[PDB]
Design a protein around this nucleic acid. Structure first.
Ligand SMILES: [Zn+2]
Lengths: 86, 468
RNA sequence: UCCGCGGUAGCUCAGGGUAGAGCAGCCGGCUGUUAACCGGUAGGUCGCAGGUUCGAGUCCUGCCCGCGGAG
């Protein structure tokens, strides 16, 4: 139950550009996989557990030096991360 | 052998610098063929090895999986997207080992982003099994395992999401522990399924696992999902039940290879002569867990790997457009990654969320339940880590056929239950592993129960080609 | 809005080479039918408008309508 259109839609949502060769390939894989998974039985689910999470105190923690941060950037300009324009 | 080294070091018989030079040489001579390490801790090793006090882990050096952040060292996650990425921070686990005298030897080879079961999906190169150069070391922590079995390192860190630590450990005949979800920090782990990921220790002896865990585990203020539970591992100074109840899982008994069935029967005889009440139990929906996993994990993976566009740190694919760059950069993913994140997007996509994700969530809650009920009647659970030993390259490259490798190990993660793979014998020349798991928080149980076995047996640990 | 099934006699649904069957309708038969049935016969915007094909209910592009399903 997987049309070439859905693949296109999916690859769109995931922002992944695959070659027409891979499309035909992945089209077969995804089919088999989605069939395997669909075999999963449905089951009832109980109360959504107790909430035992914690919160962080509003206390400042030293930041990265601008130099170290921009060193990861493929492109930087005057202390900014530089990307192609919108 | 790890604790043996630290012993020689503390008595002045050897210096940390000596141990490093020894291991560094061995790597430079054996790794070329093995392909276990991607990166190596450069001059910063020799330099760092000659400024250490006789600390708990002084003389020790660790091989870390390359999806675990190490400040100043190339952390690629086995991907092209990050083949030049070097973290400005350090993973909490790694940070702690460092503060106890430990040092990083290098970074270990893995399947791209941890999604793989054979290392055949590393963007760089495959890793070879020291026991058979014609067979895989498992995955995705294939590198770490391979490194241990060849004594390229005393200690090793891996990553487990569906058995990515146990399956390799089995294939390479070493110990691999998946920590109860929350024991070890996830901060610094380039993880792919947040709800299932855990850094796991691996070593050639159980006493060594204790060393790692005792150092690595513990509450981290940076990880909101970490448990406030003091390690206390090295208290494997046994006052061990005698008489624990052990439950064997029926569902995992059929479909195993001769060597696995054989190794299984023998193990039972051993646990019985140890004072354990061995009984067969039922893990009703265990066999259907593999499916739930390959819909829950891919889901979280799509959202976790979404950040990898060329904007701030990855590789830039050089599109020259706006979206066209993001679209081209992500095209640098491997076939397996693409496959999973496409699945993940579908399962969460509109019209399919409740029909799939919501479905698998409810099922994940069943397993936890069925497990709670099982540990009301038994204290430990036993099953194979895998139905067979390491397979040969090329053998099992079918989407589904690869997924079934993690058949027996998937359950540990969906539940959060601690699980340990231990060398339980052989079938020919290839090692065989058995999986022993306990209730939440009782990780130390697993360890001592395996110390009993490691001892009751002289050793089922063969060192393919190892030496100091 | 999207998605998935539907739209064929009047009614309810069968199916790349006269478009069909039973219900009722018409004609003929039958004195106990309960949804009588036997024979013969009549009955069409195959959704609508555009393509491929020698030939399209059947395939493929768009639209209208109905039902159902999604956090
Ligand atoms: Zn911040």
């Amino acid at each position: 139950e997987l049309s070439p259109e859905l693949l296109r839609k999916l690859e769109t949502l995931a922002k992944i550009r695959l070659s027409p060769e891979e499309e035909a390939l992945l089209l077969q894989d995804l089919k088999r996989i989605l069939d395997f998974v669909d075999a999963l039985p449905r089951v009832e689910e109980g109360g959504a557990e107790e909430a035992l999470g914690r919160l962080r105190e509003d206390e400042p923690r030293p930041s990265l030096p601008q130099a170290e941060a921009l060193a990861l950037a493929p492109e930087a300009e005057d202390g900014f991360f530089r990307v192609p324009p919108v | 052998l790890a604790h043996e080294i630290r012993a020689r070091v503390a008595r002045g018989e050897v210096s940390p610098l000596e141990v490093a030079q020894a291991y560094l040489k061995r790597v430079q001579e054996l790794d070329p063929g093995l392909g276990a390490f991607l990166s190596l801790n450069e001059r910063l090793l020799e330099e760092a090895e000659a400024v250490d006090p006789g600390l708990p882990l002084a003389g020790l050096v660790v091989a870390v999986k390359d999806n675990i952040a190490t400040r100043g060292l190339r952390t690629t996650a086995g991907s092209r997207l990050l083949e030049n990425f070097v973290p400005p921070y350090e993973a909490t686990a790694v940070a702690r080992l460092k503060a106890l005298g430990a040092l990083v030897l290098g970074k270990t080879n893995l399947d791209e982003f941890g999604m793989g079961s054979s290392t055949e999906h590393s963007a760089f190169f495959p890793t070879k099994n020291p026991f058979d150069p014609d067979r895989v070391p498992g995955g995705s922590s294939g590198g770490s395992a391979a490194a241990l079995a060849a004594d390229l390192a005393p200690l090793a860190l891996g990553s487990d999401t569906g058995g990515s630590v146990r399956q390799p450990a089995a294939f390479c005949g070493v110990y691999g522990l998946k920590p109860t979800y929350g024991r070890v920090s996830r901060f610094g782990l380039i993880a792919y399924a947040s709800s299932l990921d855990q850094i796991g220790p691996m070593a050639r002896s159980v006493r060594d696992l204790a060393l790692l865990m005792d150092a690595a585990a513990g509450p981290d203020p940076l990880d909101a999902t970490s448990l406030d539970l003091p390690p206390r591992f090295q208290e494997a100074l046994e006052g061990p039940l005698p008489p624990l109840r052990l439950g064997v899982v029926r569902e995992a008994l059929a479909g195993n290879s001769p060597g696995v069935e054989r190794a299984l029967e023998e193990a039972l005889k051993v646990f019985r002569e140890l004072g354990l009440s061995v009984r067969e139990v039922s893990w009703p929906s265990l066999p259907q867990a593999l499916a739930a996993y390959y819909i829950l994990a891919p889901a979280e993976a799509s959202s976790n790997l979404a950040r990898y566009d060329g904007t701030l740190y990855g590789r830039r694919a050089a599109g020259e457009e706006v979206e066209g760059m993001m679209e081209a950069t992500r095209a640098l993913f491997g076939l397996e990654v693409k496959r999973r994140v496409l699945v993940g997007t579908f399962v969460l996509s509109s019209g399919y969320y409740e029909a799939y994700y919501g479905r698998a969530q409810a099922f994940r809650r069943r397993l936890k339940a069925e497990a709670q009920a099982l540990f009301r009647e038994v204290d430990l659970l036993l099953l194979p880590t895998t139905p067979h030993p390491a397979f040969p390259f090329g053998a099992r490259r079918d989407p589904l056929a690869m997924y079934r490798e993690d058949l027996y190990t998937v359950g540990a993660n969906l539940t959060g239950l601690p699980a340990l793979s231990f060398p339980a014998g052989f079938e020919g020349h290839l090692p065989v592993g058995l999986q022993l798991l306990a209730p939440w928080g009782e990780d130390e149980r697993l360890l001592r129960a395996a110390l009993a076995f490691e001892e009751a047996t002289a050793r089922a640990h063969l060192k393919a080609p190892l030496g100091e």
